[PDB]
């Protein structure tokens, strides 16, 4: 009600439409009423992604790697990334008509056309053909966010490989091209892998990768298989 | 070894006697020659932090607040906080007598008043008489490092609360002063606790604080309880 009455000073209120998380801002969110106001705008704050939300928006000062900047990118389809600007000069005006616009608060590098491919059929690795890929135990930030946010991006298997206990039978294939896709971390890794796979399965494909490698194709939306940076060791026809 | 071959131009081999890791610095690693030739002048460069390892260095680019750095805080005791020039100054007056130095590549707002504290026969928290304390697990980074960083600091048990699934039974006291003391996230957070406690134990005693309040308390090895800063609600008798 407190919200409502200080909204009732308006004779029209908009209606943005914005399903959003927030990263790299906003850390401690937003008092009761200041929720309440943005929902009756139509801008619902989310506190995590669930698929189930449908979110259409991030609010970010800048291209981030976080979790959820990333997953951002897989959003179904994202609609605005938006600086958190945006809220601020909403509730600033909103606290004493509203006319804080959608198209003024742009985030650097997410433009029209990467936020586009967001509405195709298909996810970045699934269109890449990487479905089942390993993943050493001491990638930075652990292994379940690093999962979540390649699952979230088309990845169906995400196998962890604990360096230095696995053995080339840990080591799954990707089967939908590569037969075995490796994301490492230290390029000692590299020499055990490769080591491994020569010796059990010589004439097969092999692709190594470091975590930037799959961070550049997400902020891409595309695999550029082209590309020799952050590719550690591969192996082809 | 190739390794040995190279130091024999050198007709005397400090022994810098460091037993470090590195964060913000040397992400990839080193190759098999460079780890062999900085052993061969007393320094082992560990992957991961263990407590039997008792090592007295970290090298980093500045003050940071990974957990490795947090964590080298705690080491007993931290020697050396060192920039990675060093280690690269070093390599590359050896791959063409040795005179890089310990001194000139400190980190800034790192101290040997800092340093000299990490001697002291009591962790920061320890001496600040926390004990147990409740951490609420949407605290951005997880709850395990978080906890890995506070156990390193001399806090006995982490207490992991969901909000908001959690009661007042699933708070812990914190038995050695506070009776309750809280990590919290989202502002919004501090009355529901508040609110539980107060209902339950009215004439009790709660400090509830957001994460930098232990960061920046680690970073200067005191908590200061004389400060307000990054403190979000506290009860005293």
Known sequence: ???????????????????????????????????????????????????????????????????????????????????????????????????????????????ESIISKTKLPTKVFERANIRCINLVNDIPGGVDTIGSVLKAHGIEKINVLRSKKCTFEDIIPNDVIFKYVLIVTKASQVKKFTKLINDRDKNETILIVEWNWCVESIFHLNVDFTSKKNVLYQKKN
Chains 1, 2 share one sequence.
């Open 1 to 111: 009600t407190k919200a409502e009455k200080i909204l009732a000073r308006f004779n029209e209120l908009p209606n943005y439409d914005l399903k959003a998380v927030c990263t790299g801002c906003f850390h401690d969110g937003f008092n009761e009423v200041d929720i309440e106001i943005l929902n009756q705008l139509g801008i619902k704050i989310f506190d995590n992604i669930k698929e189930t939300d449908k979110l259409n928006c991030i609010f970010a000062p800048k291209i981030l790697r976080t979790e959820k900047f990333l997953k951002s990118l897989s959003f179904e389809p994202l609609k605005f990334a938006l600086k958190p600007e945006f809220i601020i000069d909403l509730l600033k005006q909103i606290h004493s008509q509203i006319n804080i616009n959608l198209f003024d608060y742009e985030i650097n590098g997410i433009n």
